[PDB]
């Protein structure tokens, strides 16, 4: 139940507002190069650094997209912002895409840290998996949504085996095979 | 069941919004009044007023909800690098409350956005929630929020919840009764 409202929160409050307009934001920037899907990272351990360079230094910030505004909930001119990132291979750019973590997992982490929330670390992993499931299902019955974005769910055990940069690039190159 | 959904959303609203803005809020307001509002009976108040309509009916534009609520200006914006999003923007709007053709108050006013999700979830088949579910959920959302705020280090007389059931009714009047109470 907890993760269910979180998943609908994410779609209703954010994904259904911005995705419909994402290509126009790209085409604006691209013409005056970046892939036209939003890449959303879903780390099941819910460990989410505000800076991606923390998760892999081969992930460097490049630019912001043009902002988007909605008047919503009686707040005037609410701003939706996204960041473009380069992904490095042997010190040199290999890819470019719009990239971010799903914020609702950062909420799930903090709830596990605060006593009044009554939420164990075991609860957090199950709610994380649940969150991923629900979001995936919502995004299937909404093709106008799925076709503008790509989800990546994964799990880490300190495993020096794992490069977030390499995994994204694996997904980027595999899109180019279509 | 209807507890855990509501519970979840209340924590989300604290973690991801309230605990980040409530601390700076009074500085933001104070700056606004000193430099841009030398109206002696027309200052902005020091609390954020959060409308909690219990049917989860949330329009996007507060002005169309009631004509005695007029948009005036925005506080200076607050930004944070969040989850890989460089420069996320938290923003708040100042509204004038009109009564008997006069100005009766000025405050920072908004709906609790999470209520929009409770509505949708009771409209979409896939979510599987009734209207009665939504009403139970909205009640528990307010209760959990109150509990959270009563123990929160960021809440320091810098917040007020306004819950109401929702013709003849007037939103501004409702907000004015809370303003006057202080
Ligand atoms: N009043 C107000 N509330 C805010 C604000 N930011 C967050 N919250 C509320 O706090 C709770 C926990 O927030 P998150 O943990 O960040 O989850 C979000 C988030 O990943 C994604 N998203 C929501 C907003 C956005 C913008 C304006 C108003 C409300 C929300 C948003 C954004 N501009 N930029 C990038 N992602 C965003 O959609 C999920 C559901 O969002 P909401 O249901 O609409 O409201 C949230 C939520 O209920 C704000 O500026 N103003």
Short mmCIF file of C-alpha atoms and ligand atoms in Angstrom, two decimals:
data_model
loop_
_atom_site.label_atom_id
_atom_site.label_comp_id
_atom_site.label_asym_id
_atom_site.label_seq_id
_atom_site.Cartn_x
_atom_site.Cartn_y
_atom_site.Cartn_z
CA UNK A 1 0.00 0.00 0.00
CA UNK A 2 2.76 2.45 0.95
CA UNK A 3 4.60 1.90 -2.38
CA UNK A 4 1.27 1.98 -4.28
CA UNK A 5 0.52 5.61 -3.45
CA UNK A 6 4.15 6.42 -4.07
CA UNK A 7 3.92 4.94 -7.60
CA UNK A 8 0.68 6.75 -8.45
CA UNK A 9 2.14 9.88 -6.85
CA UNK A 10 5.06 9.66 -9.30
CA UNK A 11 2.84 9.19 -12.36
CA UNK A 12 0.04 11.63 -11.47
CA UNK A 13 2.22 14.41 -10.00
CA UNK A 14 5.11 14.22 -12.50
CA UNK A 15 5.39 11.62 -15.28
CA UNK A 16 2.06 12.33 -17.01
CA UNK A 17 2.80 16.08 -16.95
CA UNK A 18 6.31 16.18 -18.38
CA UNK A 19 6.57 13.17 -20.71
CA UNK A 20 3.93 14.54 -23.16
CA UNK A 21 6.21 17.56 -23.70
CA UNK A 22 9.67 15.97 -23.45
CA UNK A 23 10.46 15.72 -27.20
CA UNK A 24 9.70 19.40 -27.85
CA UNK A 25 12.14 20.25 -25.04
CA UNK A 26 14.76 18.03 -26.71
CA UNK A 27 14.18 19.26 -30.28
CA UNK A 28 14.40 22.86 -29.04
CA UNK A 29 17.79 22.10 -27.40
CA UNK A 30 19.08 19.53 -29.95
CA UNK A 31 18.73 21.90 -32.93
CA UNK A 32 19.89 24.97 -31.00
CA UNK A 33 23.49 14.44 -29.68
CA UNK A 34 20.97 13.78 -26.86
CA UNK A 35 18.61 10.77 -27.00
CA UNK A 36 14.88 11.58 -26.73
CA UNK A 37 13.91 9.25 -23.87
CA UNK A 38 14.02 9.98 -20.12
CA UNK A 39 16.28 7.44 -18.36
CA UNK A 40 15.08 6.83 -14.79
CA UNK A 41 17.31 4.87 -12.42
CA UNK A 42 15.61 2.57 -9.92
CA UNK A 43 18.20 1.39 -7.31
CA UNK A 44 16.40 -1.20 -5.17
CA UNK A 45 18.74 -0.47 -2.23
CA UNK A 46 17.11 3.01 -2.41
CA UNK A 47 20.56 4.63 -2.06
CA UNK A 48 20.18 7.85 -4.06
CA UNK A 49 22.95 10.53 -4.14
CA UNK A 50 21.80 14.02 -5.15
CA UNK A 51 24.90 14.05 -7.38
CA UNK A 52 25.34 11.26 -9.96
CA UNK A 53 29.10 11.83 -10.13
CA UNK A 54 29.05 10.29 -6.64
CA UNK A 55 27.69 6.99 -8.01
CA UNK A 56 30.18 6.91 -10.93
CA UNK A 57 32.72 9.68 -11.81
CA UNK A 58 32.30 8.69 -15.46
CA UNK A 59 28.92 10.46 -15.15
CA UNK A 60 29.49 14.20 -15.64
CA UNK A 61 26.86 16.94 -15.77
CA UNK A 62 26.55 18.69 -19.17
CA UNK A 63 23.49 20.97 -19.30
CA UNK A 64 19.85 21.52 -18.37
CA UNK A 65 16.90 21.15 -20.73
CA UNK A 66 14.58 24.17 -21.24
CA UNK A 67 12.33 24.34 -18.16
CA UNK A 68 8.61 23.60 -18.17
CA UNK A 69 5.99 25.43 -16.14
CA UNK A 70 2.62 24.34 -14.83
CA UNK A 71 0.26 26.23 -12.58
CA UNK A 72 -0.81 23.46 -10.22
CA UNK A 73 -2.49 23.09 -6.82
CA UNK A 74 -2.83 26.87 -6.52
CA UNK A 75 0.94 27.34 -6.88
CA UNK A 76 1.66 29.65 -9.81
CA UNK A 77 4.46 28.82 -12.29
CA UNK A 78 5.68 25.51 -10.83
CA UNK A 79 8.95 24.56 -12.54
CA UNK A 80 9.89 21.12 -13.91
CA UNK A 81 13.65 20.75 -14.54
CA UNK A 82 15.83 17.94 -15.97
CA UNK A 83 19.55 17.47 -16.54
CA UNK A 84 21.57 16.09 -19.46
CA UNK A 85 24.64 13.99 -18.70
CA UNK A 86 27.62 12.72 -20.64
CA UNK A 87 28.90 9.18 -20.03
CA UNK A 88 32.66 8.69 -20.35
CA UNK A 89 34.67 5.72 -21.65
CA UNK A 90 38.47 5.85 -21.28
CA UNK A 91 38.26 9.55 -20.32
CA UNK A 92 36.23 10.40 -23.44
CA UNK A 93 32.53 11.00 -24.14
CA UNK A 94 30.64 7.89 -25.31
CA UNK A 95 27.00 8.90 -24.82
CA UNK A 96 24.64 11.75 -23.91
CA UNK A 97 21.23 11.44 -22.27
CA UNK A 98 18.69 12.95 -19.82
CA UNK A 99 19.09 10.98 -16.61
CA UNK A 100 17.76 10.89 -13.03
CA UNK A 101 16.81 8.68 -10.07
CA UNK A 102 13.15 8.13 -9.11
CA UNK A 103 12.84 10.52 -6.13
CA UNK A 104 10.13 8.39 -4.38
CA UNK A 105 12.88 5.82 -3.37
CA UNK A 106 14.75 8.59 -1.56
CA UNK A 107 11.55 9.08 0.43
CA UNK A 108 11.39 5.34 1.13
CA UNK A 109 14.95 5.44 2.46
CA UNK A 110 14.33 8.37 4.85
CA UNK A 111 11.17 6.70 6.20
CA UNK A 112 13.35 3.73 7.14
CA UNK A 113 15.68 6.10 9.06
CA UNK A 114 12.96 7.83 11.16
CA UNK A 115 11.31 5.99 14.07
CA UNK A 116 7.89 7.64 13.84
CA UNK A 117 7.48 6.07 10.38
CA UNK A 118 7.53 2.51 11.76
CA UNK A 119 9.40 1.15 8.74
CA UNK A 120 12.16 -1.50 8.94
CA UNK A 121 15.00 -2.00 6.42
CA UNK A 122 13.27 -5.25 5.39
CA UNK A 123 10.11 -3.29 4.72
CA UNK A 124 12.06 -0.87 2.55
CA UNK A 125 13.30 -3.53 0.10
CA UNK A 126 9.84 -5.04 -0.31
CA UNK A 127 8.27 -1.59 -0.81
CA UNK A 128 11.02 -0.76 -3.33
CA UNK A 129 10.28 -3.89 -5.42
CA UNK A 130 6.55 -3.17 -5.07
CA UNK A 131 7.11 0.45 -6.20
CA UNK A 132 9.00 -0.73 -9.30
CA UNK A 133 6.31 -3.30 -10.15
CA UNK A 134 3.40 -0.85 -9.84
CA UNK A 135 5.09 1.91 -11.87
CA UNK A 136 5.88 -0.60 -14.64
CA UNK A 137 2.21 -1.70 -14.86
CA UNK A 138 0.87 1.87 -14.89
CA UNK A 139 3.33 2.67 -17.68
CA UNK A 140 2.20 -0.25 -19.83
CA UNK A 141 -1.50 0.84 -20.08
CA UNK A 142 -0.11 4.27 -21.00
CA UNK A 143 2.04 3.90 -24.21
CA UNK A 144 2.11 7.71 -24.57
CA UNK A 145 4.20 7.30 -21.44
CA UNK A 146 6.40 4.19 -21.87
CA UNK A 147 7.61 5.20 -25.35
CA UNK A 148 9.15 8.44 -24.02
CA UNK A 149 11.11 6.86 -21.16
CA UNK A 150 13.22 3.88 -20.08
CA UNK A 151 13.33 2.40 -16.54
CA UNK A 152 16.40 0.65 -15.13
CA UNK A 153 15.95 -1.43 -11.96
CA UNK A 154 19.04 -3.06 -10.36
CA UNK A 155 20.52 -4.32 -7.08
CA UNK A 156 24.03 -3.93 -5.60
CA UNK A 157 25.62 -6.31 -3.01
CA UNK A 158 30.54 -3.01 -2.07
CA UNK A 159 30.74 -4.63 -5.53
CA UNK A 160 33.53 -3.05 -7.60
CA UNK A 161 32.08 -5.11 -10.46
CA UNK A 162 29.34 -2.56 -11.18
CA UNK A 163 29.65 0.52 -13.41
CA UNK A 164 26.45 2.59 -13.58
CA UNK A 165 27.98 4.41 -16.58
CA UNK A 166 28.56 1.11 -18.40
CA UNK A 167 25.03 -0.13 -17.68
CA UNK A 168 23.45 3.05 -19.05
CA UNK A 169 25.69 2.91 -22.15
CA UNK A 170 24.69 -0.74 -22.57
CA UNK A 171 21.04 0.42 -22.65
CA UNK A 172 21.84 3.37 -24.96
CA UNK A 173 23.65 1.28 -27.56
CA UNK A 174 20.90 -1.36 -27.41
CA UNK A 175 18.27 1.26 -28.29
CA UNK A 176 20.33 2.12 -31.40
CA UNK A 177 19.78 -1.50 -32.49
CA UNK A 178 16.14 -0.49 -33.10
CA UNK B 1 -4.92 -0.91 4.17
CA UNK B 2 -6.26 2.64 3.72
CA UNK B 3 -3.92 3.52 6.60
CA UNK B 4 -0.68 2.52 4.86
CA UNK B 5 -1.40 4.42 1.61
CA UNK B 6 -2.30 7.61 3.52
CA UNK B 7 0.61 7.05 5.92
CA UNK B 8 3.01 6.72 2.97
CA UNK B 9 1.85 9.92 1.32
CA UNK B 10 2.10 11.93 4.57
CA UNK B 11 5.75 10.88 5.08
CA UNK B 12 6.52 11.69 1.42
CA UNK B 13 5.10 15.22 1.84
CA UNK B 14 7.22 15.73 4.96
CA UNK B 15 10.46 14.18 3.63
CA UNK B 16 10.33 15.61 0.11
CA UNK B 17 8.75 19.02 0.68
CA UNK B 18 7.95 20.33 4.17
CA UNK B 19 11.25 19.51 5.93
CA UNK B 20 13.14 21.30 3.13
CA UNK B 21 11.12 24.55 2.89
CA UNK B 22 9.70 25.14 6.36
CA UNK B 23 13.13 26.19 7.84
CA UNK B 24 13.88 29.00 5.37
CA UNK B 25 10.23 30.08 5.03
CA UNK B 26 10.26 32.87 7.65
CA UNK B 27 13.47 34.38 6.20
CA UNK B 28 11.78 34.34 2.77
CA UNK B 29 8.64 36.09 4.12
CA UNK B 30 10.66 38.59 6.20
CA UNK B 31 12.75 39.61 3.15
CA UNK B 32 9.53 39.99 1.19
CA UNK B 33 7.87 42.29 3.75
CA UNK B 34 10.92 44.47 4.43
CA UNK B 35 11.85 45.08 0.79
CA UNK B 36 8.57 44.78 -1.19
CA UNK B 37 5.59 45.16 1.21
CA UNK B 38 5.67 48.34 3.33
CA UNK B 39 1.88 48.08 3.73
CA UNK B 40 1.21 48.55 7.44
CA UNK B 41 -2.01 46.57 7.57
CA UNK B 42 -1.03 44.37 4.61
CA UNK B 43 2.00 42.30 5.67
CA UNK B 44 2.37 38.68 4.66
CA UNK B 45 1.91 36.29 7.58
CA UNK B 46 4.73 34.07 8.84
CA UNK B 47 2.91 30.71 8.39
CA UNK B 48 2.31 28.55 5.31
CA UNK B 49 -1.42 27.81 5.03
CA UNK B 50 -2.15 24.38 3.53
CA UNK B 51 -5.68 23.70 2.31
CA UNK B 52 -6.76 20.09 2.94
CA UNK B 53 -10.16 19.64 1.17
CA UNK B 54 -11.58 16.33 2.42
CA UNK B 55 -13.17 15.24 -0.90
CA UNK B 56 -9.68 15.67 -2.47
CA UNK B 57 -11.20 18.18 -4.91
CA UNK B 58 -8.13 20.21 -5.88
CA UNK B 59 -8.38 22.80 -8.72
CA UNK B 60 -5.07 23.97 -10.21
CA UNK B 61 -5.92 27.67 -9.97
CA UNK B 62 -6.92 29.05 -6.55
CA UNK B 63 -8.47 32.21 -8.04
CA UNK B 64 -11.16 30.28 -9.94
CA UNK B 65 -11.93 28.36 -6.73
CA UNK B 66 -13.10 31.69 -5.23
CA UNK B 67 -13.00 35.29 -6.61
CA UNK B 68 -12.25 36.73 -3.15
CA UNK B 69 -8.81 35.11 -3.42
CA UNK B 70 -6.53 37.10 -5.73
CA UNK B 71 -2.97 36.25 -6.76
CA UNK B 72 -0.54 39.03 -5.72
CA UNK B 73 3.08 37.91 -6.07
CA UNK B 74 5.56 35.06 -5.50
CA UNK B 75 8.06 34.76 -2.62
CA UNK B 76 11.75 34.61 -3.74
CA UNK B 77 12.42 31.07 -5.01
CA UNK B 78 14.30 28.26 -3.23
CA UNK B 79 16.38 25.68 -5.13
CA UNK B 80 18.06 22.31 -4.43
CA UNK B 81 20.12 19.75 -6.36
CA UNK B 82 17.88 16.68 -5.96
CA UNK B 83 18.35 13.02 -7.13
CA UNK B 84 20.47 14.09 -10.16
CA UNK B 85 18.24 17.05 -11.02
CA UNK B 86 20.44 20.16 -11.01
CA UNK B 87 18.62 23.18 -9.54
CA UNK B 88 15.13 21.89 -8.64
CA UNK B 89 12.79 24.79 -7.86
CA UNK B 90 10.55 25.14 -4.80
CA UNK B 91 8.19 28.10 -5.16
CA UNK B 92 5.29 29.64 -3.21
CA UNK B 93 2.53 32.15 -4.06
CA UNK B 94 1.16 35.07 -2.01
CA UNK B 95 -2.59 35.70 -2.17
CA UNK B 96 -4.83 38.55 -1.06
CA UNK B 97 -8.06 37.65 0.74
CA UNK B 98 -10.97 39.99 -0.05
CA UNK B 99 -13.97 40.61 2.24
CA UNK B 100 -16.81 43.14 1.88
CA UNK B 101 -14.84 44.66 -1.02
CA UNK B 102 -11.84 45.27 1.29
CA UNK B 103 -8.52 43.43 1.83
CA UNK B 104 -8.81 41.27 4.96
CA UNK B 105 -5.51 39.33 4.91
CA UNK B 106 -2.36 38.29 3.01
CA UNK B 107 -0.78 34.82 3.24
CA UNK B 108 1.16 32.07 1.47
CA UNK B 109 -1.54 29.62 0.38
CA UNK B 110 -1.66 26.29 -1.50
CA UNK B 111 -3.38 22.89 -1.57
CA UNK B 112 -1.63 19.78 -0.25
CA UNK B 113 -0.59 18.25 -3.58
CA UNK B 114 -0.73 14.57 -2.39
CA UNK B 115 -4.56 14.83 -2.28
CA UNK B 116 -4.53 14.88 -6.12
CA UNK B 117 -3.17 11.31 -6.02
CA UNK B 118 -5.91 10.11 -3.65
CA UNK B 119 -8.47 11.46 -6.15
CA UNK B 120 -6.88 9.77 -9.18
CA UNK B 121 -6.46 6.46 -7.38
CA UNK B 122 -10.21 6.44 -6.70
CA UNK B 123 -10.88 7.08 -10.40
CA UNK B 124 -8.53 4.59 -12.10
CA UNK B 125 -9.57 0.94 -12.27
CA UNK B 126 -5.98 -0.26 -11.92
CA UNK B 127 -5.51 1.41 -8.55
CA UNK B 128 -8.60 -0.29 -7.06
CA UNK B 129 -9.93 2.25 -4.53
CA UNK B 130 -13.51 3.39 -3.87
CA UNK B 131 -14.74 6.93 -3.10
CA UNK B 132 -15.25 5.81 0.51
CA UNK B 133 -11.65 4.58 0.49
CA UNK B 134 -10.51 8.04 -0.61
CA UNK B 135 -12.48 9.71 2.21
CA UNK B 136 -10.98 7.37 4.79
CA UNK B 137 -7.52 7.90 3.26
CA UNK B 138 -7.80 11.72 3.27
CA UNK B 139 -8.80 11.73 6.95
CA UNK B 140 -5.80 9.58 7.91
CA UNK B 141 -3.51 11.79 5.80
CA UNK B 142 -4.38 14.82 7.92
CA UNK B 143 -3.98 12.85 11.16
CA UNK B 144 -0.54 11.50 10.20
CA UNK B 145 0.57 14.93 9.02
CA UNK B 146 -0.52 16.55 12.31
CA UNK B 147 1.35 13.85 14.27
CA UNK B 148 4.44 14.39 12.10
CA UNK B 149 4.35 18.20 12.51
CA UNK B 150 3.76 18.07 16.26
CA UNK B 151 7.15 16.36 16.66
CA UNK B 152 8.94 17.98 13.74
CA UNK B 153 12.00 20.20 14.43
CA UNK B 154 11.31 22.18 11.25
CA UNK B 155 7.80 23.17 12.30
CA UNK B 156 8.15 26.22 14.59
CA UNK B 157 4.86 28.14 14.20
CA UNK B 158 5.61 28.18 10.48
CA UNK B 159 2.74 25.99 9.29
CA UNK B 160 -1.06 25.67 9.58
CA UNK B 161 -3.36 22.94 8.22
CA UNK B 162 -6.86 23.99 7.09
CA UNK B 163 -9.20 21.01 6.70
CA UNK B 164 -12.83 21.45 5.57
CA UNK B 165 -15.63 19.43 3.92
CA UNK B 166 -16.72 20.79 0.52
CA UNK B 167 -22.56 26.51 -3.24
CA UNK B 168 -22.79 29.11 -0.47
CA UNK B 169 -19.35 28.02 0.84
CA UNK B 170 -16.47 30.51 0.66
CA UNK B 171 -12.82 29.41 0.68
CA UNK B 172 -11.42 32.84 1.57
CA UNK B 173 -13.77 33.17 4.56
CA UNK B 174 -12.59 29.75 5.78
CA UNK B 175 -8.95 30.89 5.51
CA UNK B 176 -9.79 34.21 7.16
CA UNK B 177 -11.23 32.49 10.23
CA UNK B 178 -7.90 30.68 10.71
CA UNK B 179 -5.90 33.88 10.09
CA UNK B 180 -7.97 35.82 12.60
CA UNK B 181 -7.66 33.08 15.25
CA UNK B 182 -3.90 33.64 15.65
N1 LIG C 1 3.50 21.79 -2.87
C1 LIG C 1 4.79 21.25 -3.41
N2 LIG C 1 4.97 19.95 -3.14
C2 LIG C 1 6.05 19.29 -3.55
C3 LIG C 1 7.10 19.99 -4.29
N3 LIG C 1 8.05 19.06 -4.56
C4 LIG C 1 7.61 17.89 -4.01
N4 LIG C 1 6.42 18.05 -3.40
C5 LIG C 1 5.55 17.07 -2.73
O1 LIG C 1 6.17 16.33 -1.69
C6 LIG C 1 5.89 14.93 -1.83
C7 LIG C 1 7.20 14.18 -2.05
O2 LIG C 1 7.83 14.68 -3.21
P1 LIG C 1 8.77 13.69 -4.06
O3 LIG C 1 9.42 12.77 -3.06
O4 LIG C 1 9.78 14.58 -4.74
O5 LIG C 1 7.96 12.86 -5.17
C8 LIG C 1 7.48 13.57 -6.31
C9 LIG C 1 8.57 13.85 -7.34
O6 LIG C 1 9.54 12.82 -7.53
C10 LIG C 1 7.81 14.07 -8.62
N5 LIG C 1 7.88 15.56 -8.78
C11 LIG C 1 6.74 16.26 -8.19
C12 LIG C 1 7.20 17.58 -8.52
C13 LIG C 1 6.37 18.61 -8.11
C14 LIG C 1 6.41 19.95 -8.56
C15 LIG C 1 5.54 20.94 -8.08
C16 LIG C 1 4.58 20.64 -7.11
C17 LIG C 1 4.50 19.33 -6.64
C18 LIG C 1 5.39 18.37 -7.13
C19 LIG C 1 8.40 17.67 -9.16
C20 LIG C 1 9.28 18.76 -9.68
N6 LIG C 1 8.89 20.18 -9.56
N7 LIG C 1 10.44 18.37 -10.28
C21 LIG C 1 10.80 17.07 -10.40
N8 LIG C 1 10.06 16.04 -9.96
C22 LIG C 1 8.87 16.28 -9.33
O7 LIG C 1 6.51 13.49 -8.44
C23 LIG C 1 6.35 12.94 -7.12
C24 LIG C 1 4.95 13.33 -6.64
O8 LIG C 1 4.85 14.75 -6.49
P2 LIG C 1 3.59 15.44 -5.79
O9 LIG C 1 2.64 14.33 -5.48
O10 LIG C 1 2.97 16.38 -6.77
O11 LIG C 1 3.94 16.36 -4.50
C25 LIG C 1 5.14 16.06 -3.79
C26 LIG C 1 4.99 14.75 -3.05
O12 LIG C 1 3.60 14.51 -2.73
C27 LIG C 1 6.86 21.43 -4.56
O13 LIG C 1 7.72 22.09 -5.21
N9 LIG C 1 5.72 21.98 -4.10
#
